[PDB]
Structure formats: structure tokens, C-alpha cells
Design a protein around this nucleic acid. Structure first.
Ligand SMILES: [Cl-]
Ligand SMILES: [Cl-]
Ligand SMILES: [K+]
Ligand SMILES: [Mg+2]
Ligand SMILES: [Mg+2]
Ligand SMILES: [Mg+2]
Ligand SMILES: [Mg+2]
Ligand SMILES: [Mg+2]
Ligand SMILES: [Mg+2]
Ligand SMILES: [Mg+2]
Ligand SMILES: [Mg+2]
Ligand SMILES: [Mg+2]
Ligand SMILES: [Mg+2]
Ligand code: NA
Ligand code: NA
Ligand code: NA
Ligand code: NA
Ligand code: NA
Ligand code: NA
Ligand code: NA
Ligand code: NA
Ligand code: NA
Ligand code: NA
Ligand code: NA
Ligand code: NA
Ligand code: NA
Ligand SMILES: [Sr+2]
Ligand SMILES: [Sr+2]
Ligand SMILES: [Sr+2]
Ligand SMILES: [Sr+2]
Ligand SMILES: [Sr+2]
Ligand SMILES: [Sr+2]
Ligand SMILES: [Sr+2]
Ligand SMILES: [Sr+2]
Lengths: 194, 56, 81, 46, 65
RNA sequence: AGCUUUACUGCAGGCUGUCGCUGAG
RNA sequence: GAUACAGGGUGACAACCCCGUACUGAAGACCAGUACGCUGUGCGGUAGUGCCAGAGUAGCGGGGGUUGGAUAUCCCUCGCG
RNA sequence: CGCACGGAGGCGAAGAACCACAGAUUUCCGAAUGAGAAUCUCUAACAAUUGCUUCGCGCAAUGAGGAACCCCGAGAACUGAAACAUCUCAGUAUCGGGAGGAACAGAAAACGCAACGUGAUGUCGUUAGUAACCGCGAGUGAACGCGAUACAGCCCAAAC
């Protein structure tokens, strides 16, 4: 039979209809008054969190992050530039907003490591994402067969090196065939042309 | 008044001094920032790629 | 652990203070206070210290001018070393 | 000017460094203080 | 030289301290004689006194005092 | 290279319509 | 003399004056807590069953960047889905 | 009894010097962390941000460094086009963030010598200056495959 989780999932396919719509319209009022990174005791989208690796266990943390919507907040050139490089308004950053959120979260919890993240909506001027972080030093996690991998030294600051799920997609690594000529194994090894 | 020799006479102000962190006489005692190692500005040590030739 | 007293400061001026004012002069650790210089001296030579004057020298060391009580005799204390 | 205790220690060292190569080092090495600083002609740090 | 390691390990914790204070004093009296330009010195001892003190302290650490 | 303008081409900025935030009769 | 005629030193050009050099052997480090071996677990197959299988996703549109990617690169942003 | 061939003196058969491994000591400033300060000073200290929590700094984490290499972001201009704007120089220089001894990638919603075929991923040789791009100017420029190197395949979410 359908799991209860499937119901949370189904509700979020359309965050603008049904009960969920009313919920968001209510919550966001509170969210807008919260800070940039708010640790929350329980995931707003349980199915999504569990699906991404979450576990109701010690050392597993969740935090909601809000980031402004839109293009790059860029300063206009202050020296000579050929027309092609004089733009300001239409320039957008190469990291998606969800990735910016993951980074702001990880900075707030220097000792933790980003496991994954997901969207929880947006209003006219900002977007919210909940990030799942893991304490690589807590024995409850060092002994977990499904999560202890994140304890290895080479997994340090993984979010800042694009090893996150949103990181790998944003780096054009989704495809294994056509189109990934300059993305795999890394953007840098391919001369930054991805 | 000439900008040269005559204007050198008023220079009796102490600015750059021996730095607690790097030992160079570059700790600006008015700004409390070392121009050589960055002490007072950053925990990380001041360093730039342009301090050497690009391919080196 | 650093010791308070380094060594006796023996110079002509030091001798005058010894003969004429019952004072002994020492090179002492620059982290030592007048009180610490006083104690250390009483304990090393067994005498009574009345007053201590200090100076941070242009040699990088600290000089202490220690006056002894009339009960003790600087010349004698110094003479045994 | 007013020197702090630390500045004083440094000036002190500079003065000491300003001494000559002892007589015996000359014999021992069978034959210059490349750091002889004059107060007027030279300039110390700080 | 004169003070060997065995001799230091054979001393009791209280004997090393007493011995330490004794050595420190010979040292201080030597540096005093040196300060007075006194030449009745014997350069080897002032140098030996330092090592002896280092040895005793090392043993005190080793023996737990 | 600095400067000018109804030189060429663009870039900020301002004005204005539209979409999102955005709801009830 | 040579399984040693590499090199160096030594009051001038040295296999045989000295260090070494060939041969043989020893130790540490790396390979690696890897390979091998082992303990436990249990692989798989037939038939029936619409019980399960990752959403602002797939995909579309507006504006940009990027790429050899041209209608047919990868990515960002706003809207829709 | 350093460089360093002096003087005086000392150490070594109680086996020193010297070399290897292990240990002791290791001032002050320094990420610098009780607070302040041009290496000092003032009156108990994981400062700051976090996780766990006996909710007490009790147990822990982060910070900074390193020759370059590596990964993620920001990103010129001189120059070339015999001028110059797209293009080029170049995703170069430089900047921000971060890991390791190597990084990154990686067990197909692949390939598409179209097949009765291949079978995770780097990399090397080649495919090839080919296809593709481009005031279709100057210039720019892959991939599948193949020959090699080395080989390794698995764990969740959900159903119950
Ligand atoms: Cl992280
Ligand atoms: Cl094939
Ligand atoms: K140009
Ligand atoms: Mg690589
Ligand atoms: Mg005074
Ligand atoms: Mg003098
Ligand atoms: Mg001109
Ligand atoms: Mg381009
Ligand atoms: Mg401090
Ligand atoms: Mg040109
Ligand atoms: Mg032309
Ligand atoms: Mg190019
Ligand atoms: Mg292909
Ligand atoms: Na972190
Ligand atoms: Na002295
Ligand atoms: Na001067
Ligand atoms: Na000009
Ligand atoms: Na691209
Ligand atoms: Na788009
Ligand atoms: Na040491
Ligand atoms: Na700490
Ligand atoms: Na606490
Ligand atoms: Na030209
Ligand atoms: Na020109
Ligand atoms: Na072009
Ligand atoms: Na073939
Ligand atoms: Sr870090
Ligand atoms: Sr002045
Ligand atoms: Sr500062
Ligand atoms: Sr730097
Ligand atoms: Sr003097
Ligand atoms: Sr002068
Ligand atoms: Sr699936
Ligand atoms: Sr294989």
C-alpha cells in the first residue's frame, strides 16, 4: 500500500494547491522574520529528507536557508572593457541558488558536512531550502553503515568543492554520454569550458 | 613651498613599525594593520600570485 | 622555570652604594617585581631587605638596587662571594 | 620619543650586535662585522 | 663528570632536590665570581654545573620526582 | 591618452507596460 | 688481484697506498592493513499479484552566459509545468 | 669540546665524540583562543561558530600552514584580425573559497563503427586539425570507436 510518506511527496508536487498552499502562505510569514540560517528540529518535507539520506538519529541536523531571488548582484566595470564585457543587468552567476544555500549553511556549522538539500518554496523575493548536515565526529554516525562514509577526511568541506548532489548537477555531470565532454571528470581539467 | 627638500622637514611621524606577527617593519601603528603579512587584517597570511612571475 | 637573581652587578658605582649606603646591586630577571627581588634576596643571603629600586637596562636585563637593614652589612654579604 | 619595554629590548640587542668580531676569532679562523651600524649614517627599524 | 647518572638515580627524591639547590648555588656563586671579573675560575665547572642541573631535572621527571 | 558631440557601437541610470510575490467580493 | 679496470683521496698520470667498487648479506620505509587465507551472511529459479521504485523534477517559454555543439553543448536566472 | 687551525680550561676505559630510533625540556609573539598590546601587559578563561549533551565548555569539531599539483566559484587587458565592434588573446593573468597525498571522476534514464554489436571511471596513443563553430574573415575545434594502462563493484529511499 501507499506509504504515508508518499502523501507528503504528492502534496509538494503542487505547492500552490490544496492544504499545502494554505500552509506555505502561513509559514512564510514566520520564515520572513527568521534569520538566514535557522536550524529546525524536523524536516518540512519528510519524504524528501529521508529519500536524500536523512535519519532521525544523533548527529543529523537540518537547517532552513533563505537566499535572494534573481541574477548576479554585480558592480559595473570601473576600467576599460570591450562592449561584450560591459554588461551588468543580465549577468547571472554560475552556481544555482540552492548551492549558495548549501554553502551558507555549512559555514554556519563549521564542524558539520552537507549531505544534501531540497527546496521548500519561495515568495516574490527569496527562496528557501532545507539543508541536511551530518556530524562526522559523532559516534552515532561513525557507526552508521549508511552514513559513516561522510566521515572520511576527503569528504571535508565537500560542499565547497562541489561534491554535493546539487553541486554535481550544477557542474553538468548528470549525463554520462553526449554533452559531458567538458564537464567530466571536472570543469577545471577541461579548461573551464563546461 | 617646494614639494621636495623643504617639505621633507616635517616628516617626524611614526607609522610603519616592527610587526608582532612577522617581524617586518610594516605594522602601521595608526591603522594597526601590517602591510607585509596582513596581521590585523586577516587571520590568513598576506600572499599574492603576482609576487612572482606567472609561470613560477 | 626562571630564577629571580641572575648575578651581582659589580661596578664602581655598585661599590659606592655598598660601602656608603648598605645596598647590593643585582642583575635580575626582567619579569621579577620589587617584591620578588626582595624575597629572593633575603632567602639567598639571609638578610633583611629594606627597599628595592629597579631599572630596565639598555643591556636587555633588569638591574635592582637592594638596600639592606642596618642589622646587616652589605660589604660583608658581598665579600663572601 | 617614549620607548616601550619591548622596543627597549630591541634597541638593546641592536647595540650589542654592534660590537666587533673578537680578537681570537681572527686567530682561530686564520683570518669583518658585516652588520656594523652607525647611529647617524644608518637607520634601525620601527 | 664528577656527578654521574647512576649516582643521581640512587638518590632519593628529596636528595635530588637538596642536590639541585646545592648545584644551583655553586652556579650562582660562579657567575658572581665571573661578574666580578674574578679569574680564579675553572671554565669546565660552570659548564658542568649546567649539565648536572639538567641531568638531575631530567631524572626527577623520569622518576616521577 | 585626456576632452567633446545630433560620429559608430554599447553599458549604467530614470520613466513606462507586463509576469511573479498576489488574496476575497 | 680482478664476479672488483665506477668515482674520489693521497706532495705529479694509482685496479693492487686510503675510502670505495664486484660478489654476498642486513635493516628501515613504501607497496599494504593490500593479496591470499578465514568467520558469519546467503546466491538463484518458476508462477501469480497494476504492492514499491527519488517533482518545481522531465519537459515548455522569456532573458543571459558558455561550448565545436551547429535547430543538435553545458549552465544560470524569471515564469509555466 | 659546531662552522672556526685562539687562549685558558674541561670531558672521555664509569666507553665520550659521532650516527640511528625513541623520550625529556621546549621563554614570548604567532590560527592565537580570558582581555588588551608594534613580541608586552591586565584580572581565571576551547575567544568565536557549531555537534552531542550528565544543559556544566562535561565530551568533541572548525580556524592556520605547505613547492606546486587538485577541486569549486569571480574573471581582464595589452595582443591577433595588419583599423575595429562579434571573434581572438582566454575561461588565460589575477582574485575569493576548499581538500588530499594525490585530487576530481565512476558502475548507464550510456553508446548508436545501427548491431545477432560495446558494456563504470580517469589517463596515454590515435581517431583529427576530421565533424562542428566563425564580420563563413582571422581564427576556433571535439566525440563515438580503436590500441594501451589499470581494473571492481556496491549502499540507500520505498514496498513488506
Ligand atoms: Cl560541507
Ligand atoms: Cl561500440
Ligand atoms: K579586445
Ligand atoms: Mg583529472
Ligand atoms: Mg622605575
Ligand atoms: Mg657600548
Ligand atoms: Mg585616442
Ligand atoms: Mg566565448
Ligand atoms: Mg591573546
Ligand atoms: Mg588589431
Ligand atoms: Mg578583415
Ligand atoms: Mg576557444
Ligand atoms: Mg559520441
Ligand atoms: Na561546515
Ligand atoms: Na648579565
Ligand atoms: Na638614525
Ligand atoms: Na592626454
Ligand atoms: Na559550455
Ligand atoms: Na531558460
Ligand atoms: Na624541541
Ligand atoms: Na577547540
Ligand atoms: Na558546555
Ligand atoms: Na594590426
Ligand atoms: Na589602433
Ligand atoms: Na565570429
Ligand atoms: Na572496428
Ligand atoms: Sr576546513
Ligand atoms: Sr610633523
Ligand atoms: Sr581587521
Ligand atoms: Sr593569497
Ligand atoms: Sr653596556
Ligand atoms: Sr641623517
Ligand atoms: Sr528510481
Ligand atoms: Sr573493467
Amino acid at each position: 500500500a501507499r506509504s504515508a510518506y508518499s502523501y507528503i511527496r504528492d502534496a509538494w508536487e503542487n505547492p500552490g494547491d490544496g492544504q499545502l498552499a494554505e500552509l506555505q502562505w502561513q509559514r512564510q510569514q514566520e520564515w520572513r522574520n527568521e534569520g538566514a540560517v535557522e536550524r529546525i528540529e524536523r524536516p518540512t518535507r519528510l519524504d524528501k529528507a529521508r529519500s536524500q539520506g536523512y535519519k532521525a538519529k544523533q548527529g543529523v541536523i537540518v537547517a532552513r536557508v533563505s537566499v535572494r531571488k534573481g541574477s548576479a548582484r554585480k558592480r559595473r566595470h570601473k576600467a576599460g572593457r570591450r562592449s561584450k564585457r560591459q554588461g551588468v543587468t543580465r549577468i547571472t552567476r554560475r552556481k544555482d541558488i540552492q548551492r549558495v544555500a548549501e554553502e551558507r549553511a555549512s559555514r554556519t556549522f563549521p564542524n558539520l558536512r552537507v549531505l544534501n538539500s531540497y527546496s521548500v518554496g519561495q515568495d516574490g523575493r527569496q527562496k528557501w531550502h532545507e539543508v541536511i548536515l551530518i556530524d562526522p565526529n559523532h559516534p552515532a554516525i561513525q557507526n552508521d553503515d549508511d552514513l559513516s562514509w561522510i566521515c572520511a577526511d576527503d569528504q571535508a568541506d565537500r560542499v565547497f568543492r562541489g561534491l554535493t548532489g546539487a553541486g554535481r548537477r550544477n557542474r553538468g555531470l548528470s549525463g554520462k554520454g553526449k554533452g559531458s565532454e567538458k564537464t567530466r571528470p571536472s570543469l577545471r581539467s577541461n579548461g573551464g569550458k563546461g | 613651498t617646494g614639494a621636495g627638500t623643504p617639505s621633507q622637514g616635517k616628516k617626524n611621524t611614526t607609522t610603519h613599525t616592527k610587526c608582532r606577527r612577522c617581524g617586518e617593519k610594516s605594522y602601521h601603528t595608526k591603522k594597526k594593520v601590517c602591510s607585509s603579512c596582513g596581521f590585523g587584517k586577516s587571520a590568513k597570511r598576506r600572499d599574492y600570485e603576482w609576487q612572482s612571475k606567472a609561470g613560477e | 622555570s626562571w630564577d629571580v637573581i641572575k648575578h651581582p652587578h659589580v661596578t664602581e658605582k655598585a661599590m659606592n652604594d655598598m660601602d656608603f649606603q648598605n645596598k647590593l646591586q643585582f642583575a635580575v630577571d626582567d619579569r621579577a617585581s620589587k617584591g620578588e627581588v626582595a624575597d629572593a634576596v633575603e632567602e639567598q643571603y639571609d638578610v633583611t631587605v629594606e627597599q628595592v629600586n629597579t631599572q630596565n637596562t639598555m643591556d636587555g636585563e633588569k638591574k635592582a638596587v637592594v638596600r639592606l637593614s642596618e642589622d646587616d652589612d652589605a660589604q660583608e654579604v658581598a665579600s663572601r662571594i | 620619543g617614549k620607548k616601550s619595554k619591548a622596543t627597549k629590548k630591541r634597541l638593546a640587542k641592536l647595540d650589542n650586535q654592534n660590537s666587533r668580531v673578537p680578537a681570537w676569532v681572527m686567530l682561530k679562523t686564520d683570518r669583518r662585522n658585516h652588520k656594523r651600524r652607525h647611529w647617524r649614517r644608518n637607520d634601525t627599524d620601527e | 663528570t664528577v656527578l654521574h647518572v647512576q649516582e643521581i638515580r640512587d638518590m632519593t627524591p628529596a636528595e635530588r632536590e637538596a642536590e639541585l639547590d646545592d648545584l644551583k648555588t655553586e652556579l650562582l656563586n660562579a657567575r658572581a665570581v665571573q661578574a666580578a671579573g674574578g679569574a680564579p675560575e675553572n671554565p669546565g665547572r660552570i659548564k658542568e654545573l649546567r649539565k648536572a642541573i639538567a641531568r638531575i631535572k631530567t631524572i626527577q621527571g623520569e622518576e616521577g620526582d
